[PDB]
Amino acid sequence: MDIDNYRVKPGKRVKLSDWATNDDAGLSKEEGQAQTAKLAGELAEWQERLYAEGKQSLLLILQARDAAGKDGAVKKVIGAFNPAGVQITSFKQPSAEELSHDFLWRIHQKAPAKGYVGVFNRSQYEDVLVTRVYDMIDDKTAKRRLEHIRHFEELLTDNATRIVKVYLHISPEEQKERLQARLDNPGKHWKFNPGDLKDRSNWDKFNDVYEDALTTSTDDAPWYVVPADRKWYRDLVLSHILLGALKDMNPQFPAIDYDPSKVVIH
Amino acid sequence: MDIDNYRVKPGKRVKLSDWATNDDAGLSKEEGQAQTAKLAGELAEWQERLYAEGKQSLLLILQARDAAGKDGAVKKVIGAFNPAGVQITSFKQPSAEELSHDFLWRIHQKAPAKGYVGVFNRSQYEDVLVTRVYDMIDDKTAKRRLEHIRHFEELLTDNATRIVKVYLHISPEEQKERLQARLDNPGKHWKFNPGDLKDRSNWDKFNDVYEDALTTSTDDAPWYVVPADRKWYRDLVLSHILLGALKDMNPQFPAIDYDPSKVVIH
Numbered sequence A, B: 001m002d003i004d005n006y007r008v009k010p011g012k013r014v015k016l017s018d019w020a021t022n023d024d025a026g027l028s029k030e031e032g033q034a035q036t037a038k039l040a041g042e043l044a045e046w047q048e049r050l051y052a053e054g055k056q057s058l059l060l061i062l063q064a065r066d067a068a069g070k071d072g073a074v075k076k077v078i079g080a081f082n083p084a085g086v087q088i089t090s091f092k093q094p095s096a097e098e099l100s101h102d103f104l105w106r107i108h109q110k111a112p113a114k115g116y117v118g119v120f121n122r123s124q125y126e127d128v129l130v131t132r133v134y135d136m137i138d139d140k141t142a143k144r145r146l147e148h149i150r151h152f153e154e155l156l157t158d159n160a161t162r163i164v165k166v167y168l169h170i171s172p173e174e175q176k177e178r179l180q181a182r183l184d185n186p187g188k189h190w191k192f193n194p195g196d197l198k199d200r201s202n203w204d205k206f207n208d209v210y211e212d213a214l215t216t217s218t219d220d221a222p223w224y225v226v227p228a229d230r231k232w233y234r235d236l237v238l239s240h241i242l243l244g245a246l247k248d249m250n251p252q253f254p255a256i257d258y259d260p261s262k263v264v265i266h
């Protein structure tokens, strides 16, 4: 398994048809889940070092279609961290106050603080995705917003915020099964709504706007196209993406301002 | 077991000395850890239902002395929840802007939203604890603030926010062991500073002000004194306290207003 094959290389436009949705790296469901469990412990040790150092931060931007596994990726992978060093934000339709500001106003407010892991379940890229498919903005506006997004991610990069953008990539047939599954199991009826089917009818339009958004992939702010047909594999790759980022950040425990040898606890 | 022995009953004044610090309910560390692990799954099932329903909220208020187990209780017990349905806040020294407002301003801002679990690592009670030991306020101010806190907790209770306040109860000699360990292990020097020792020298003054604070215990907003000398036991009791609240709240999955069988996913 080379995780870098899933990284959108800088400057190269992408075709979603050229990326697989159901890779498994020649691993069984058990070998993957077992390895994902071992990585869960590794993720925790490094998230503790990140919080102790208090100099850097990690920002995961999760973008995907309905039933792709955003909720499951957070519950399984992000659940490995100490929840006190994590901040999760699920961006839904902008409120009235949010619309009275530029489109990055509400986004910037949730940027992670030093020492924290930040997650955007849906993010600023919504403003150049669903907003385009349904003609809330035109191509001119969309293009400029993408330039504004790059600069925003460049701002946070110089602030020591390591950016990682992940797109969970599934096939239409896999989505069909998962949507039918929510309709068949009484316990999950609440996760399905008459409107997940509208975005489905515009599947090919979302391909175009998603491929546009992926052009923001740089060395400092990379995109990853993660085959997500297999949920265990989705979790396994994301485990590798986040831990590999954490290890490259190499957070060191903080210095002390006292002499331990000379302290007398009364 | 009986968790109700650890609940400060309404209207009755208490002395912390009346509670043991190293209870175990006749369980070994292993049988306890096993029980804590078995309950983690139930906490998760009910936290998902609470978030799915979106009508109620759970507020945990954590108060405890140095090396008593605030961070460890959160990492172990609160770590059972999906971090997307949780909000943790560690209240430190008030900032300048926070001091320019009433003492509950920064607290109220962090009240949990419907469907969420909220945790306060240190809380509004700091304003009637450390503020008194070091003569930042007088007895008259402290007494009135305690009334304002009860009203505040009554406000959130009528909002369907289930309040639960926990005090982790350890002995001085256990604190001495835990602090000396950080001075002895180089890997833990960063968790200690010669300032953790100031509150320790005023242990008996904190007894008085903590015992005053416990009088806000009501049927709706109870306090709990949890013997915390044994770290595995702290985690076991807190799991029971929080799961008992979630089960008593009894959050229900939301009903649907459509017929899944006649939905046609093209």
Ligand SMILES: Nc1ncnc2c1ncn2[C@@H]1O[C@H](COP(=O)(O)OP(=O)(O)O)[C@@H](O)[C@H]1O
Pocket (backbone or CB within 6 Å): A066, A067, A091, A092, A093, A094, A122, A126, A127, A130, A131, A191, A196
């Ligand atoms: N900036 C934005 N402008 C318009 N719509 C947005 C924006 N950001 C998010 N949304 C929309 O909010 C909705 C949130 O859906 P959500 O309830 O999270 O779906 P599910 O829970 O089924 O995954 C999405 O349909 C998304 O397109």
Ligand SMILES: Nc1ncnc2c1ncn2[C@@H]1O[C@H](COP(=O)(O)OP(=O)(O)O)[C@@H](O)[C@H]1O
Pocket (backbone or CB within 6 Å): B064, B065, B066, B067, B068, B069, B070, B071, B072, B073, B178, B181, B182, B188, B191, B231
């Ligand atoms: N010296 C140590 N040995 C073993 N575990 C430790 C040590 N120091 C801290 N821990 C871990 O940290 C937790 C204690 O949390 P702590 O930081 O004392 O909370 P508080 O904020 O009240 O000081 C323990 O449950 C344990 O998991």
Ligand SMILES: Nc1ncnc2c1ncn2[C@@H]1O[C@H](COP(=O)(O)OP(=O)(O)O)[C@@H](O)[C@H]1O
Pocket (backbone or CB within 6 Å): B090, B091, B092, B093, B094, B121, B122, B126, B127, B130, B131
């Ligand atoms: N409302 C408040 N007024 C005055 N001091 C406060 C208040 N809330 C918290 N503090 C103080 O802030 C300090 C935070 O200590 P620190 O060790 O940095 O936090 P923690 O141990 O919780 O990680 C504590 O000594 C506490 O007394």
Ligand SMILES: [Mg+2]
Pocket (backbone or CB within 6 Å): A191, A192, A193, A196
């Ligand atoms: Mg939905």
